[PDB]
Symmetry: D4
Subunit: 206 residues, 8 copies
């Protein structure tokens, strides 16, 4: 479709990615990065379109995508980047930075709710309804459905708008500096997950 570009292995070029921030999500075979391989990277330059990239089993390189991940002048926007950063670093050897996490930003601004999922915050903050996938998907399937492409694109099509609103909220309630420190630490939080502390709050007393 005009909204969703599908690719195998990597972006074909970075012509669409002369931007200051990109929105990223991933699909995997599950929540254990050492067991469950990366299957899809979905990314948007913020212009209302998305690229959905199918990652092959055993794929070690994605040079164009990795250029964006390494580029320190490009902010990588995630919703709950803690997981995606670990998966991406594990897959391609580069820990993306710098980052903005809309879920951390939601936790620091939407102090009246415990519901910080992407669907909930898109409805509340953007008046955008994204459909939640009900049946679980084998994202390692050789052929991905158009339904799967649409779900994957919906994860990134709105993160730039979400970041814009959450930055306003962070400034309004006075927590911009703390959010930024969380974003600076988040790559280390993901590293510690890969290293063996996925189940531990390193800052907890016990």
């Amino acid at each position: 479709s005009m909204t969703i570009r599908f690719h195998r292995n990597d972006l074909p070029n970075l012509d669409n990615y002369q931007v200051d921030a990109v929105a990223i999500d991933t699909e995997t075979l599950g929540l254990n990065p050492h067991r469950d391989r990366l299957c899809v990277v979905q990314i948007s330059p913020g212009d209302g379109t998305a690229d959905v990239i199918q990652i092959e089993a055993g794929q070690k390189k994605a040079p164009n995508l990795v250029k964006l991940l390494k580029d320190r002048s490009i902010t990588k926007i995630f919703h709950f980047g803690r997981f995606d950063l670990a998966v991406l670093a594990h897959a391609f050897g580069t820990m993306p930075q710098p980052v903005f996490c809309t879920k951390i930003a939601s936790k620091l601004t939407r102090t009246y709710t415990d519901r910080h999922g992407l669907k909930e915050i898109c409805s509340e903050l953007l008046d955008v309804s994204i459909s939640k996938q009900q049946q679980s998907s084998d994202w390692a399937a050789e052929v991905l459905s158009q339904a799967q492409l649409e779900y994957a694109a919906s994860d990134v099509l709105y993160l730039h708008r979400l970041k814009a609103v959450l930055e306003q909220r962070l400034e309004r309630d006075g927590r911009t500096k703390q959010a930024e420190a969380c974003f600076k630490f988040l790559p280390t939080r993901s590293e510690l997950d890969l290293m063996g502390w996925a189940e531990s709050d390193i800052f907890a007393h016990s």
Copy 2:
């Protein structure tokens, strides 16, 4: 005693504190910084002596101590600095930095135990036995006992040795960079505690 110097309100001067790192702990009326005032600051320059400073109710200033807290060329060593940093920032208005936390360092090196208390790690890493206070203390008492001064000093007399050993262990098992990122974030972790997130892991999914 020759090991422990007692002071009211503040250090009398910084003649003893021409150092690159200081060891710090505090005593309070309890674990809620908004309710439970700061009562004692104990600090050591690492030379085998300690200063124990009695903090008065309503005391808003401690200029000599605060000079050390603000001095970015002086590393402040804590065991579980997350709490002390919040108490100190709440009391005097300065968030101390930069910091080294021996409890975070223990969690990242002593991967074979869940026991990361100061007494346990001093015994294991330093062959130093520190006596644990058994009965709970009113640290807001007008007169502090010599026993209380000794307990307070024991909290800081060994942190320089502990940091030396833990830095070696961090380098041996390859986690120096992650530890340093945790130390950079820790002042924000303490800020978030004071701001209302004391009971939340900001990096958790839910």
Copy 3:
């Protein structure tokens, strides 16, 4: 509308409030009064209308509303006043009294259920259906919607009727005196919450 009067900062006058009891609720940025500011005070004199007052960030005074809060000849009716009393005292410096809490009264009369929410008790006791707000609201928004005004007004439009029925039930089952003692203590319960005991039943054994 004729049912709902909107105001900024404060009631314009007390012409509508020559009454023996007022019904009050609040909206905030969340459940932590030290973190989450007061955003809305909604109040009804019991005549089938409601005033919805938008409270600005940093607002320290609301003189007309505070006159009602201080007036010991005016009973302040809440549903779960424990929270609202703490928020109001924190915002404006006056602990409202005397009070009647329809949730405490429900607990002492509706001994056949664990459901003591306002919607449930309005349906059962008054045959009045109030719509529950489904999506969470940013009550600190510069502009409040008419939907938000209606939700806020629904919190206070029926508390006088509810108190009338609950007083009858308290007398029928013989617990008026105990309810009144609870209402006398409730301002202290809210004070203790602000002081640091929000998570503790002060009367519990342990």
Copy 4:
């Protein structure tokens, strides 16, 4: 002994009780006042002696003791009066008042510990060691041992000293007014226990 006077049913007179406050504890057959009868009332006028009164099965009256319970000019001191007030009111028909509870006072002053038992607070606040009874006692036995009399007396011999110290601590940390409101409510808390709410915090949200 000179410290402990034993009585059957009631105090023989109130010659020893021309005082402004009395210290009281009880022994029962267990923690359920409707099932487990009152067996012993122990009381001290604060002069370093104690009266231990054996209560018979089915005993409905204790006129001299009840005169003290009703006397509003005499403060009844308990450690955790919530239970004793319910037992006494159930046994003799009078809810004692006014009261001072050293356990509530401890909770409001000893903010650095979760240990608020009588033995712990006597050691810490009074430097008085009271022996804890290790084996459980049948307090309904026809004959009480001297050991049992000593345990019962130890419960009341020090409450006046404890109240003196805790009043100083309440004033030092600024919570005298809140403590007094708790003491005023406590008789109602005990009434609500007898009425069927022993397992419910009436002030809880849910």
Copy 5:
């Protein structure tokens, strides 16, 4: 209606009750028999009709109903008689016996489910759909609704049919003798509840 006869205080006579078994349920102000008075007794002779008896506050006698409760030649059928037996014994001073409990019988026969409620077992065993009351009822109300009468009657209109089917199932799977021993003990189980063991399995190890 022809199915439901309403009475105040007691059955007018026992002309309808020349039977070998009666079906009984009750309504109360809640689940604590010492606090929550008996409000309704509903009873059926098994002929497809039901008597619904409104019990007044403070009512100590119901002579015709109590004749049935005491009559050892008449089996009293309950669904979960453990509660009703305690309420009835508390209200009128007679522990009904002998009894049959369809819930105990269900537990001993319907070994393939954890759902032993009356609605579930009537649907499964009788192909009879009884409507569950959704909103909670004040059964102490001076005036009971026809809806309330129908709910109360539905509790007893089918227990004879249920007992017939459950007796067949008990015989089929070989547990008639154990069921009968449970029914013989059940009045004592209800007595122990009234005596103070409502929260304890007396046969448990600990």
Copy 6:
């Protein structure tokens, strides 16, 4: 129907069972094999038809079915065979082997979900919707309904297709060898359940 053949006690012959694998499920009176007898065995040769065999109370033999269970050249396919293997071994004295368990295979392949029920995996892997039985069934009833026969047949009509897809997934993600070792152990796991370890993970540390 042409899809479902009903039998009493046993298959009439094995003309339909000249196959390399059979799909099997059972129905019982509940989840405790020592208490809850086998009531139904449902089996399919994989050709789109199913045999539903009613097992009588006290039935000790089913010679034709047991020939299939013992035949080591015939793989017995189950969904969660752990339970069925114990029930079958308990009923007829033969532990079926070798086996394939689609639930173990699902756990080893569908690493992105915790939902491993037959309905869920048939929908996801086969695009086959099987209706879940909502009301609980007495499977020991003398007469089984056509609805019950259809539910029982649905348990086995698709297991050959499910095994085909799961074998492909096991090979794709590299866990065929581990799955096969689990299938070899499963008969012992069921034996240990019958022997008294039904509630213990024998491989757990503690």
Copy 7:
């Protein structure tokens, strides 16, 4: 010794057992009667001596002991008979009756404690100290130690004294009738354990 007579398989005669009550305990290979065989029966006629009977693997008969178990004129005293009754009935085919259980009697009299073990109640009620076995024993060993014989005898040497005291306590606090009903039901409680309800309180609501 003169206190302990050892036997293989059975009592040699009943010359010592012309009594109205016997005290009984057992030893097994564990707490699951279907898995863990009976190994020892220890029994006392109440005269200060005990018989310890070693039960062989596969032993189906113990005629002299079983005569006592069946004899309805002989009360069988246990501490927690619920388990021993199931083990004995499983081993020899006779459910012993009538019974007295000192643990049920303790629960109904010692309302001031949750500690109802034999050692605790012997110390408190009899002033008799019995040594608890610290290391776990293989009671199926071909040769039992004298230490094991002494432990086994200590289980029964004092139950007659314990029953005497507990009967007095039951009469004093008015619960003799309820205790007797519990003793009448206990054989059924043990039957239900053997039948498959060992983990269920049959009288519970859910």
Copy 8:
């Protein structure tokens, strides 16, 4: 000492290992094999001596030890081999087999206890007291203490005796075949741990 031979990296030869079974344990930096490297392998040929082998950081080969691990004619005895098998396979690339696990064997024989630790079973089954290490050890230390060597040797010096006794117990209580099936599966259980199922019972329903 004559009992303990220390080696760096590997056994110097297999002259001592012309045996049918070897006893093995390991020491690591913690319980996560992907994070916590192998530090020590301790092994005994069953002759009352032990070899303690220090494993270097990054060591990928131990050819003589690995010859024993691969040798299918040599049974590898562990206490809780589930962990050691994963650590050894992760370190050197060979999954040891066949195996005997004394902890699984204990679980299948010592049905009267939940205590299956090596110290407990050595005391009970062998009358051998092994000292438990109290303080936690850094097993990655460049220099291991003689105390550490003795602890490590104590883990393997008695496993042959333990296996001898447990085989007798397995035969006595009839579970040899089930134990052997568990031992055959255990290498797969350890593989599944390394693959990502360390926290899941693969045989559980859910």
